[PDB]
Design a protein around this ligand. Structure first.
Ligand SMILES: Nc1nc2c(ncn2[C@@H]2O[C@H](COP(=O)(O)OP(=O)(O)O)[C@@H](O)[C@H]2O)c(=O)[nH]1
Ligand SMILES: Nc1nc2c(ncn2[C@@H]2O[C@H](COP(=O)(O)OP(=O)(O)O)[C@@H](O)[C@H]2O)c(=O)[nH]1
Ligand SMILES: [Zn+2]
Length: 400
């Protein structure tokens, strides 16, 4: 059922690896071999023909193996493959072939951990396939075009979720075509699981636990999550746990306060509500807070742009040289701590993934990096690049 593709410039050993992991052809496409305790299927100038084959993988596969040649190091040819493979939200696992038994900066290709393999004698193959297979559980049931931005609204019953959607969809900039499809400024969007939020009126709400769980599945399926709070009734414990789940899952978040028409708006009421939110949702300092009214339509026009902005940052891919300049600047600004007699050293940093943006800093010892300092590095990356609306992950790793 899961489909796997091997992509890379010619002469990296794709065919050799393919033939090994491929069993027989199917009633074009191949099933995985018997020697594998994993069940899946396989799919079979310079730029022109790389681009075509890469775009077949990005179109047909669920997981892509990006293969390079360990004997050569990173070629400029490999770099153009990488640049093309940035175009997909589909998981890419990096395979460094022809290492019959010294992996550095393949990281530099920006897909994180390289997996050293050998078509020769299956060395490193267990690890590669484990990494490929980990992504299987996350393969979407409902599959939309890559261009589509999927998002969801969540919040307690009668916050105004249905009302927001309708006001939003009633805008001049929108064309509407279990999920709801539409375009805004001609960009394709999907609101995940709009059936779930409109199940009231069909059905009495006897408990909230199924709705909670059903909302977590929509979050799993989304890239941006709109956490909608009730301006009138204020914040509650249920709001934090779900927002907590969204943040933990690495989703872009925007916080929406609805029913703002119904609040006794003194000059400072908004700032106070903003501060209250920051205090209760301390893990969402990246998420912007939008005040609006689904009823009077005040500031409804600000929602979509925030969702767009948050989706962009969520999938933002930084250039390495700039990233390293930013981290050096930070260490120069704020020298690294000493943890039990030894000082932390940072050598290099690269982005390893998007959605959310994740970075690996190579260090002396990941133990010596305090969480506070990791938080400090996070803030300087944000200062430099923006990243509003999305969490970022930072990992310390030992060279070697
Ligand atoms: N040393 C070594 N050579 C390999 C390995 N895998 C493939 N080759 C050789 O590298 C060349 C490329 O093989 P092929 O599978 O056709 O690569 P492709 O161009 O990516 O399809 C062939 O001559 C293979 O014999 C490997 O793991 N180690
Ligand atoms: N004052 C005010 N009432 C609202 C607003 N949005 C929704 N409501 C009301 O709150 C109730 C809940 O609306 P609904 O969209 O069904 O909540 P949902 O469960 O989140 O979908 C309805 O009576 C709405 O008329 C708003 O912006 N201001
Ligand atoms: Zn310490």
């Amino acid at each position: 059922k899961p489909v796997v593709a091997i992509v890379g410039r010619p002469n990296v050993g794709k065919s050799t690896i393919f033939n090994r992991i491929a069993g027989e052809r199917i009633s074009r496409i191949y099933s995985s071999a018997e020697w594998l305790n994993y069940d899946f299927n396989l799919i079979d100038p310079f730029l022109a023909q790389i681009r075509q084959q890469a775009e077949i993988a990005m179109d047909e596969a669920d997981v892509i193996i990006f293969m390079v040649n360990g004997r050569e190091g990173v070629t400029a040819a490999d770099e153009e493959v990488a640049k093309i493979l940035y175009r997909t939200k589909k998981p890419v696992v990096l395979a460094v072939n022809k290492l019959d038994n010294n992996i550095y900066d393949f990281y530099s290709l920006g897909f994180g951990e390289p997996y050293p393999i050998s078509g020769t004698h299956g060395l490193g193959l267990g690890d590669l396939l484990d990494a490929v297979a980990e992504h299987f559980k996350n393969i979407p049931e409902t599959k939309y075009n890559e261009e589509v931005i999927q998002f969801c609204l969540i919040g307690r019953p009668n916050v105004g979720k249905s009302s927001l959607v309708n006001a939003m969809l009633g805008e001049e900039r929108v064309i509407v075509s279990v999920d709801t499809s539409f375009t805004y400024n001609q960009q394709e969007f999907v609101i995940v699981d709009t059936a779930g939020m409109r199940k009231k009126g069909k059905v009495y709400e006897t408990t909230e636990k199924y709705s909670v769980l059903r909302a977590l599945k929509a979050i799993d399926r989304s890239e941006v999550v709109a956490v909608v709070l009730d301006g009138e009734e204020g914040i509650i414990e249920q709001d934090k746990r779900i927002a907590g789940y969204a943040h933990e899952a690495g989703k872009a978040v925007v916080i929406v306060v609805n029913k703002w028409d119904a609040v006794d708006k003194d000059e400072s009421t908004m700032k106070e509500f903003e501060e209250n939110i920051r205090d209760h949702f301390q893990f969402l300092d990246y998420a912007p807070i939008l005040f609006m009214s689904a009823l009077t339509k005040k500031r409804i026009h600000t929602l979509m742009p925030a969702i767009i902005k948050a989706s962009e940052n969520h999938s933002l891919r930084v250039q390495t040289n700039v990233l390293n300049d930013v981290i050096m600047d930070a260490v120069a600004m704020n020298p690294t701590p000493t943890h039990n007699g030894s000082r932390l050293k940072i050598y290099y940093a690269t982005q390893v993934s998007v959605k959310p943006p994740s970075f690996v800093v190579f260090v002396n010892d990941p133990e010596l990096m305090h969480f506070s300092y990791e938080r400090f590095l996070e803030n300087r990356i944000r200062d430099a690049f923006g990243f509003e609306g999305t969490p970022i992950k930072i990992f310390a790793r030992a060279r070697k």
